[PDB]
Amino acid sequence: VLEWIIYTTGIIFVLPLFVEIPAHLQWQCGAIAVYFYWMNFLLYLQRFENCGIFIVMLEVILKTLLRSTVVFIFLLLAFGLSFYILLNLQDPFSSPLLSIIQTFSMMLGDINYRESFLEPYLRNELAHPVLSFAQLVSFTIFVPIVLMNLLIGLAVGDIAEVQKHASLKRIAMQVELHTSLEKKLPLWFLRKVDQKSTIVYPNKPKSLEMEILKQKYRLKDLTFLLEKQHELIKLIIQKMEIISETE
């Protein structure tokens, strides 16, 4: 999808090479092309080993964030549609869609307390003062504090889980890269470039489980030997001589 968008818009950005075009369309396609080009460059960077674990982390966090919008987009609807009614005489809240975008922007802590709540209140320009100040407190508690801390905790967990398997995943990426490359090169070329050894001059420019497993094996061998010994002892008793100590 990314590459289809890139090619379709890049072909329109430079189309006046052949056929004329309005400047507005040309630059509005350039704005999309120059953005998706550099966003798609990261998928090329994710191959190299020194900088490909960050793309894995970025993808994990982004997926986790997108799986929760199906839920936490109704908080935005609730607060935006109530702010559209309470603060309707102000320009940032003069339309349902603008009021939902302003509420999305206030999610990081940029609430505009003095400009939207205090100063209209001291001018007698709030239609519902008590409700407007109660909504401010409930919003501040619910969204910039609770929701953002929820997202931070999720990200901390995801990154810990990714770091737990960093080395193995890093090596497996390289192994898979070269394995895929081998299934497409010609035979004679692989014969030509392959080597059998290498020379290096340095001067020139999960344990506890294994232990308990081993000792389990030892214990089983011990049991086997003890049973053989018990059989031998019973044989002794049934073959011995008893004369003076008979009943």
Ligand X SMILES: CCCCCCCCCCCCCCCCCC(=O)OC[C@H](COP(=O)([O-])OCC[N+](C)(C)C)OC(=O)CCCCCCCCCCCCCCCCC
Residues in the annotated binding site for Ca(2+): 3
Distance CA 94, CA 81 (A): 11
- Report in angstroms how near the CB of residue 148 gets to ligand 0IG at its nearest: 23
| Separation of alpha carbons 241 and 244, rounded Å | 9
In angstroms, give the least distance from the CB of 85 to a second copy: 4
Rounded-to-integer distance, Cα 110 and Cα 132, Å: 17
Q: Does residue 93 contact residue 99 with C-beta atoms inside 8 Å?
A: yes
Which structure tokens are listed for 8? Answer: 């379709």
Q: What is the largest CA-CA distance in the chain?
A: 127
Q: What is the pattern of x (binds a second copy, CB under 8 A) and - over residues 112-151? A: xxx---xx--x----xx--x-x-xxx--xxx-xxxx-xxx
Q: What track of x and - describes contact with ligand 0IG for positions 113 through 152 (by CB under 6 A)?
A: ----------------------------------------
Shortest reach from residue 61's CB to a second copy, in Å: 5
Give the other-Cβ count within 10 Å of 66's Cβ: 9
Question: Is the CB of 15 or the CB of 75 nearer to ligand X?
Answer: 75
Interaction residues for ligand X, span 26-65 (CB under 6 A): 31-32, 35, 39, 42-43, 55, 58-59, 62-63
Both tokens assigned to 187: 């035979």
Alpha helices in 87-143 (DSSP H): 96-105, 113, 119-122, 129-141
Cα–Cα distance for residue pair 88/137, rounded to 1 Å: 19
Question: Residue 121 Cβ, how far from ligand X at the closest point, in Å?
Answer: 6
Binding residue ranges: 3, 214-220
CA distances from 141 to 69, 107, 123, 149 (A): 19, 11, 26, 11
Contact between 9 and 36 under an 8 Å Cβ cutoff? The reply is: yes
Give 113's Cβ-side CA count (13 Å radius). Answer: 8
33-92 residues in contact with ligand 0IG (CB under 6 A) are 45, 47-50, 70
Write out the binding residues for ligand X, residues 91-110 only, by CB under 6 A: 95, 97-98
- Report in angstroms how near the CB of residue 199 gets to a second copy at its nearest: 31
Chain positions 189 to 228 lying near a second copy, rule: CB under 8 A, are 207-209, 211-216, 218-223, 225-228
Return the number of the residue (123 or 204) whose C-beta is nearest ligand X.
123
| Contact residues for ligand X, defined by CB under 6 A | 31-32, 35, 39, 42-43, 55, 58-59, 62-63, 82, 95, 97-98, 129-131, 133-135, 137-138, 141
| Contact residues for ligand 0IG, defined by CB under 6 A | 45, 47-50, 70, 174, 177
